Amino acid sequence: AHSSXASLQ
Amino acid sequence: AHSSXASLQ
Amino acid sequence: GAMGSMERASLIQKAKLAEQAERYEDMAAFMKGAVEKGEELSCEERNLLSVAYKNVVGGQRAAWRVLSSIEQKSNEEGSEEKGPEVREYREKVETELQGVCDTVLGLLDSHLIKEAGDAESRVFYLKMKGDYYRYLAEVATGDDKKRIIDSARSAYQEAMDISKKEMPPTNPIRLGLALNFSVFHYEIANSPEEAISLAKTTFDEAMADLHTLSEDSYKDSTLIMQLLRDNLTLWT
Amino acid sequence: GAMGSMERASLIQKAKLAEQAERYEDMAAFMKGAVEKGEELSCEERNLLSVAYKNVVGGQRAAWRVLSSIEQKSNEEGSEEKGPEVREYREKVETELQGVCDTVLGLLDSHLIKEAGDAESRVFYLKMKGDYYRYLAEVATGDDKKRIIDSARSAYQEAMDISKKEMPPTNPIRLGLALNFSVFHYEIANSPEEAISLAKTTFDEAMADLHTLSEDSYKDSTLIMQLLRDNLTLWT
Ligand SMILES: [Cl-]
Ligand SMILES: [Cl-]
Ligand SMILES: [Cl-]
Ligand SMILES: [Cl-]
Ligand SMILES: [Cl-]
Ligand SMILES: [Cl-]
Ligand SMILES: [Cl-]
Ligand SMILES: [Cl-]
Ligand code: NA
Ligand code: NA
Ligand code: NA
Ligand code: NA
Questions:
Q1: Burial class (CB in 10 A: 0-12, 13-18, 19+), D220
Q2: What is the CATH number of domain D1-236?
């Protein structure tokens, strides 16, 4: 399954 | 440029 | 600690450089040093902390899964005995993974969570607590497995309660929390129906709130909604 | 050393597991431990050593290039002053990269090269010596830069002399050596014409020998020939 998360940078 | 290398495994 | 002599702002700057260089162990060490300065983290700084450790533990989890699969195959009938090495090396990677989780949990407990009063920070940290207990649960097999699972559950549940009271249904933190708690239900807690129900309710309540958002916020929210959809497609 | 208590065969086995798990730092540490047992390496073991360190140093080189580019931009006219952090962090990565190169060079000098009598092993190790001096040369800026470059050149040249006397023009070790020495000429030694001439002669002399090979050897040789071609296309 996919879980959360990307960088704001 | 490309240099040499792969795994035998 | 080795970062004790470096300015807080310099640690943050170097964390950003480390990210650009894909040096995530360095990034995590810089961010640990920044946390240990004792000041609260801004939203940007929380996301640097999260990105750094998620990449470190992600590589460890991927390696652990490869090694665990080899170890399981070796224990099948007809498999030739190869000695203790596969178990030893899986245990080595496991111990390092557990150490990273313990490090993150330690930062959260000393003292990020207790100083976090705004909903966005407190939900963010409680979600992280759930996530790192979840990663511990992925590898747990002993007397404390049930307590590790319950620690993940309890952290996620507290985060959920705050997020539902204090954040709109499209808030990306809230969405990512619900996404991860749904994964917890499916993959850790043996509760696929709960996972599916949570993902579908979360998706639908976010859908209904999109009309309130700017174009940029809409993009942020719909990205995570698509992950909920992707999981629903896998699971149903 | 931390691997001193582990059997040679167990270190080799764990190096192979580490490769499958994409744990290249571990793989390199296992292979260093295996070398330090003092026995010669088989062809398969030499290639585990090479793969491990090439992945470790490759990540360091990629990070160094990112950071060096940021540092260069910061030194342009009109760039805002941001303090010592970019230089410091580039220097940190550089020092770690140099340490890995020194480690590899140390294994070669103590005592892989001196025990290597067959052409395939000796050419393999001398090529590696050239490669790791080349990586040192990529980051060198001081009084010893010329001597580092000459050390790379000298190692490659000795490997070339042996390979031309003792190996067919299609041998993949010979081809990869010539490929890398050509890159040395182009990127380190400021000798693009030499690089181009070497790549073209190597390619043509391999072409003429392909008819002697089995299907599997043909595949091995043509893979490296294509890299020679790709470089020629970049450079001309
Ligand atoms: Cl910054
Ligand atoms: Cl081990
Ligand atoms: Cl609950
Ligand atoms: Cl549940
Ligand atoms: Cl083996
Ligand atoms: Cl630094
Ligand atoms: Cl020469
Ligand atoms: Cl030259
Ligand atoms: Na058998
Ligand atoms: Na064994
Ligand atoms: Na300015
Ligand atoms: Na600065």
A1: middle
A2: 1.20.190.20
